[PDB]
Design a binder for these strands. Structure first.
Lengths: 62, 46, 77, 94, 103
RNA sequence: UAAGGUGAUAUGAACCGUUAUAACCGGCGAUUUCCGAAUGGGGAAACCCAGUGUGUUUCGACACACUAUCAUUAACUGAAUCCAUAGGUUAAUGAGGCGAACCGGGGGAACUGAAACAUCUAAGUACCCCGAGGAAAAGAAAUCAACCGAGAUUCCCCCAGUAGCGGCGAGCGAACGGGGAGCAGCCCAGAGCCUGAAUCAGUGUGUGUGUUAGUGGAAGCGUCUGGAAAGGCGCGCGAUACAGGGUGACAGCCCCGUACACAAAAAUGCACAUGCUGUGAGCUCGAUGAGUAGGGCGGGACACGUGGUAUCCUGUCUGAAUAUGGGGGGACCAUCCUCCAAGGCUAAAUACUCCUGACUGACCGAUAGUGAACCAGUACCGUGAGGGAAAGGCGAAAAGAAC
RNA sequence: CGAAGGUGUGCUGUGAGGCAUGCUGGAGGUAUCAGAAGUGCGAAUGCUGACAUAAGUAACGAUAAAGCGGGUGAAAAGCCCGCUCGCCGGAAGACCAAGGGUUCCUGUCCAACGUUAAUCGGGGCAGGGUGAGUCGACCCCUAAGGCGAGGCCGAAAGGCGUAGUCGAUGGGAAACAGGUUAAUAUUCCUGUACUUGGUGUUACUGCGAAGGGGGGACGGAGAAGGCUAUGUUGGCCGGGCG
RNA sequence: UACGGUGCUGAAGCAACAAAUGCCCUGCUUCCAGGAAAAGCCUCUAAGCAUCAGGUAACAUCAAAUCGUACCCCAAACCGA
């Protein structure tokens, strides 16, 4: 997804990151209960977040 | 019968703990030696 | 530390030999002395822990020169 | 003022147990697993934002990890922070 | 640069199922393949209440060494060896005997 | 580079991926909690407590940066005290700590031997301390030699267990000279002319060649025994590849490789080539290292134990000449010969292996080999420094024994 | 078509030994003549492991003591329940510090551990459990003492020490009663309290420290007097009529 | 009534006497051997600031973080294998 997310603004990125974080939180909440029967999702979300962070760093002073 | 070891944590730490070891040159040397050996517990420190 | 500031004379080790040649370790300390030296240029006394040899050297050369040398060496006075 | 991002990270899970259940039912108090670094205020903030529910007070405690033995090898479970969060009267939590 | 792959029909050079043929089912990182119908073992499957397994003498396909199988060339009617070569900026396998590309 | 993947004990679950952002491998980046030199202050290491400033706030608070010490230089400030200096506050630069051995320096034992023991030996060893480098140190004759000559240092073989030293005991033990490895010479004590002239370091660029992923890489079938063939017996083929490892028993031709031939977007080592910054070459005139050389007293080093003892170093007290001069040639003198101390720099041959890769072994094969083939510096023991084990093998394949 | 190794047998050599072969074993061995040695073990109060002997012997860890009924169970002297009995009671009870670090509670299991059995356990496995403005630490302050910028001293390492900064075992703000869990409670809940900080206020109007002063701030023994904790008796209230 | 317990309910709830080694008492009396420190706390001003801040006054609001809290603790859990 990085090539797609690279074509964005800083503000845009930040919002996306926030959203991702929220999603992750939700997953965690679900995971703890017996709701989440799709574990890979959590793995994905974290990765996405990381990618976003990396992108942000690249943008701001690199 | 009052046996020799009469534990006290603070006393132990002050005596033998990491910071004490650091404080002196000989202590430092000891630490270094331990490291070289491969000790898991470098000091008395928990 | 017993070190002439002008000359650099430290203590050196050696032996006491007895009449039966019994070596025993000893030191040879330098003949140090703290002496106020008048510095004519700056118009003040500079105290220096110096050997008698150091003093002699100073006399020979001029205190100023000695001071300069010391400075060059990175030594406070 | 706690950062949104920080808040999201704070709260680890709901804690299911008899005691917890009792707390929920009788005293209107939810029992959460939270980050070990998460202070009380932060936790409260997280609760308010992320569950949308007024908080009366948060009590925290640190649970020490049990030492176990997997076959011959000894090994310790992690410490973790439990939080009893008391919700205001009439606050029903999903 | 792996000469045998998932969906290749192979012939067995050695063992109890030597001479027989079968499609490779899957290939393992250990340097062994599992081929369809070839190396069979009658495992005694231990029942478990969970996962809906009844438990019985199940005849399943054990692995075989990749070295023990060979890619079969349909044209020659025989086992062959595989070579590698670049056709149109892309690496492809070919039968050593007859020099034709694997497709 | 790919058709398979999501490290291991260790399956499963939920998934991703298959001609190219799945996974894997390599370059350059990003992230990099806390403790630790630990450096904002403190501290019972992985914890406690700040200050200042810049931004934000839903005004409850957040965030993130900086704040050690010393050295050096600079700026401002500044006592007794007039000027000054000490001191003080900032700023910049560097240092600090760790690390196997080797290296140089500062200190420095004893057991032991002498069939006792004190000189002597062990030994400038062990050990402690400081400092450095990929090597270090040494180094460009005030050196040897012998009236012939050699031509800085270092290292190897001789010289030679010689000459010597030595309670002339135990022991210690050269040099000259010869054969080799490698070889390199320069600058300042200073000013004149000429002005960018050799060389060196940092730093870009270019070329060559490595290194850090990789790619291709030959040729075998039948039959007998057998659980299985790579074995037997037949008949073939490859070989710049019969190194090695695996594969159901021993395989050149089944697999991985091997010989051989190729490969780098990116980073980077070493050679030369070249630009820029600093550095000054050649010429003439000189100048030619003083509390120094020597000496006395005391020690130490020289194979050399004070001896008839040259030479070097110096704790102590002295103290020249200064090239028409001075040093040395093993007491000392005379003659001759030979060199120019009291300022520096300097590659190579030499020393070592914590570590990386490749290959080898009349080396070990589980009481051996590392203490450690195994989750070992672990368990366990000890207040602590510290000590410190035992423990490998089902099968070809779990087909690990349903009922 | 069975290597080494293991184990029998037969033959053979003057001996160390050798050859052959049955069984076991399941993959290596190696003639000859040379070469090199970690080359031969019964002893070393040798070292390591294994296994004997004494011997089914001594002992089973305070002479506070048991008995029976029922339960569960494969099985009960030992576990659970009950009724008796006995022991401690300035402790063998209750609550802490130190030290330990999950031993707490529940379910479950009995190989090993428990000096016997064990259904039980401080044993195995799984899950649960520790809630603070006022308790303690942290924090502010210091003692003995430690470290210590500069500094003085010292071959080096380092020693001593000023300013300072650490250091409790001492000084420094504040909470009680009841109820509750299988397991926490001055921490949860119920009631009723207190503290010292900010911030904002209106009201007022001398505030301000690295300094001054007070205070904090203190020994042994003795003697009482006033009290309460607490206990006894009566009253009261509930129950009883053997 | 899952024989563990849970829910409701609830009388009197006084007096006298005795009484600590506990409290008043960091007191008092006495003795010689002559009995921590520093902060919190109260107070005084200096430099300062000056009609601002700061101080005390009540009242409102916010605040009190962090770590410990199980269990044993004269012992079968600590020091003695």
């Amino acid at each position: 997804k990085a090539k797609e997310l690279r074509e964005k603004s800083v503000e845009e990125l930040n919002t996306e990151l926030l959203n991702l974080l929220r999603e992750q939180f939700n997953l965690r909440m679900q995971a703890a209960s017996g709701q989440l029967q799709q574990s890979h999702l959590l793995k994905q979300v974290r990765r996405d977040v990381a990618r976003v962070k990396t992108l942000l760093n690249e943008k701001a002073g690199a | 019968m009052k046996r020799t070891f009469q534990p006290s944590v603070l006393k132990r730490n002050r005596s033998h703990g990491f910071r004490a070891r650091m404080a002196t040159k000989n202590g430092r040397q000891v630490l270094a030696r331990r490291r070289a050996k491969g000790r898991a517990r470098l000091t008395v420190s928990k | 530390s017993r070190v002439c500031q002008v000359t650099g004379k430290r203590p050196v080790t050696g032996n006491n030999r007895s009449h039966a040649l019994n070596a025993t370790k000893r030191r040879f300390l330098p003949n140090l002395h703290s002496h106020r030296f008048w510095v004519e240029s700056e118009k003040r006394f500079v105290t220096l822990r110096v050997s008698a040899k150091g003093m002699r050297v100073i006399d020979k050369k001029g205190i100023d020169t000695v001071l300069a040398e010391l400075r060059a060496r990175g030594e406070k006075y | 003022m706690i950062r949104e991002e920080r808040l999201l990270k704070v709260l680890r899970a709901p804690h299911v147990s008899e005691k917890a259940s009792t707390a929920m039912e009788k005293s209107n108090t939810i029992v959460l697993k939270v980050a070990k670094d998460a202070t009380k205020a932060e936790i409260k903030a997280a609760v308010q934002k992320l569950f949308e529910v007024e908080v009366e007070v948060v009590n925290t405690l640190v649970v020490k990890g049990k030492v176990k033995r997997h076959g011959q090898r000894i090994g310790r479970r992690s410490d973790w922070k439990k939080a009893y969060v008391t919700l205001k009267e009439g606050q029903n939590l999903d | 640069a792996a000469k045998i792959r998932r969906d290749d029909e192979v012939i067995v050079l050695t063992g109890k199922d030597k001479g027989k043929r079968g499609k490779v089912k899957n290939v393992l990182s250990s340097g062994k393949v599992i081929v369809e119908g070839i190396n069979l073992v009658k495992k005694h499957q231990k029942p478990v209440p969970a996962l809906n397994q009844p438990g019985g003498i199940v005849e399943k396909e054990a692995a075989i060494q990749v070295s023990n199988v060979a890619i079969f060339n349909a044209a020659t009617g025989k086992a062959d060896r595989v070579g590698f070569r670049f056709e149109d900026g892309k690496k492809v396998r070919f039968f050593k005997s007859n020099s034709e590309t694997i497709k």
